[PDB]
């Protein structure tokens, strides 16, 4: 039944100020701690500082320099500050809740019990950029036995995330997309392929959906053989 | 600060087998003060147990905990597809909490040869003044592969990257994209463009070529 909702800007500047908060439903703050916990991407999980209602805040000593956490108990809400950023802060950011009730200091903590989601803050001096979509088209060089494979390269983007579809999701089976790798230009390339019959191609369309958000962009890309 | 090293780091097992977890804290702890958490790529770490055995509700039986000391173990006594997952210890005993880095818990499935795909790059992007070749590495366990760019047999490095997508629901392969990055100077200063592929089932490494000017 408690749940959470985020919000809070994702995409800053280096030296910026991250201001992140989250509302709790479902459930009162009170009696409870309450903390924010990050990941970076394919990396594990770290603990940032808890609050509860009152007021009391247990900050990471590896952070307590740059990091601040608020509490409004009248809108049920809690609220962390981070300064001093850096690209290293680029990571997905989650509210949780402990898993027992704890009052303002009890020196061994509970378990986290409910998390939320998590939301990606992205730190970096690069600015939003729009990516370029270029087909990956089906050749002699891309077929294996009735099987021909096509796909679309999105190139130089940031930040992220970006969604790809096929078809505009009519088209799901044998299709692949890829993480992103970070270049180093500071923007993102990923790619999304598929395999359809060698003898679809001619007669059936195959068009590559690409929605980035952040620069407002979204490009539909139709993928002809050689 | 409470370092926690998991242990293995990876573990390939199949539904219907047991599978055993350790987390190793740089000091000694109480049980009462450990937890374990499941994450599926994609979304929010779950709670399975706390205080060392306790199971979090939802949680079935055949998850397992225990250890005192330095030394705490989980147990998924059989496995089932819904556990196979990244999983995570954590000790809240000492400020401040730590995790450990983790211990995936992969499909043991048959040995899967890629099927090996490549694309030169496409005229929209030539007239970008850049040119990227990917290669298609499809349907293939297990994850350990090798990707090779040559161009005109020269050898390339620093100038490619790779991406692994997540292990896949229905079949449990992996397949990995590779991109190959040059200006188009570069690029057209040569002929021979070629993807080599290493894989535990193939008998010999796959070569996919072609030539500028196809």
């Known amino acids: 039944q408690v749940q959470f909702q985020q919000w809070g800007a994702g995409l800053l500047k280096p030296s910026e100020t991250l201001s992140l908060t989250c509302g709790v439903y479902?459930?009162?703050?009170?009696?409870?701690?309450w903390s924010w916990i990050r990941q970076t991407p394919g990396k594990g999980l770290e603990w940032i500082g808890e609050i509860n209602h009152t007021g009391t805040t247990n900050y990471n000593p590896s952070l307590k320099s740059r990091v601040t956490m608020s509490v409004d108990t009248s809108k049920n809400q809690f609220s962390l500050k981070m300064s001093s950023l850096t690209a290293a802060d680029t990571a997905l950011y989650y509210c949780?809740?402990?898993?027992?009730?704890?009052?303002?200091?009890?020196?061994?903590?509970?378990?986290?019990?409910?998390w939320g989601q998590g939301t990606l803050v992205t730190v970096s001096s690069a600015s939003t950029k729009g990516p370029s979509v270029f087909p990956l088209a089906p050749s002699s060089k891309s077929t294996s036995g009735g099987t021909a494979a096509l796909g679309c390269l999105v190139k130089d983007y940031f930040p992220e995330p970006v969604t790809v579809s096929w078809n505009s999701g009519a088209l799901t089976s044998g299709v692949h997309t890829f993480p992103a790798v970070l270049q180093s230009s500071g923007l993102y390339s990923l790619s999304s392929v598929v395999t359809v019959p060698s003898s679809s191609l001619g007669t059936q369309t195959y068009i590559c959906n690409v929605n980035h958000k952040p620069s407002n962009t979204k490009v539909d890309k139709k993928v002809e053989p050689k | 600060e409470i370092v926690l090293t998991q242990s293995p780091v990876s573990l390939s097992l199949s539904p219907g087998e047991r599978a055993t977890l350790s987390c190793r804290a740089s000091?000694?702890?109480?049980?009462?003060?450990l937890a374990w958490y499941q994450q599926i790529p994609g979304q929010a770490p779950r709670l399975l147990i706390y205080?060392?055995?306790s199971r979090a509700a939802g949680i079935p039986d055949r998850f397992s905990g225990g250890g005192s000391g330095t030394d705490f173990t989980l147990t998924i006594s059989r496995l089932e597809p819904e556990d196979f997952a990244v999983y995570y210890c954590?000790?809240?005993?000492?400020?401040?909490?730590?995790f450990g880095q983790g211990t995936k818990l992969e499909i043991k499935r048959t040995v899967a040869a890629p099927s090996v795909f490549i694309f030169p790059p496409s005229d929209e992007q030539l007239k970008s003044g850049t040119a990227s070749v990917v290669c298609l590495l499809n349907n293939f366990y297990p994850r350990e592969a090798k990707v090779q760019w040559k161009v005109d047999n020269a050898l390339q490095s620093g100038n490619s990257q790779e991406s692994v997508t997540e292990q896949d629901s229905k079949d449990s392969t992996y397949s990995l994209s590779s991109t190959l990055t040059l200006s188009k100077a570069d690029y057209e200063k040569h002929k021979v463009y070629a993807c080599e592929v290493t894989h535990q089932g193939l008998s010999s490494p796959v070569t996919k070529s072609f030539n500028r000017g196809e």
């Open positions: 205080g060392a055995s």
């Open positions: 954590q000790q809240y005993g000492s400020s401040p909490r730590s």
């Open positions: 479902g459930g009162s703050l009170s009696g409870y701690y």
């Open positions: 949780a809740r402990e898993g027992a009730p704890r009052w303002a200091l009890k020196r061994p903590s509970n378990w986290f019990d409910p």
């Open positions: 000091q000694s702890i109480s049980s009462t003060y």
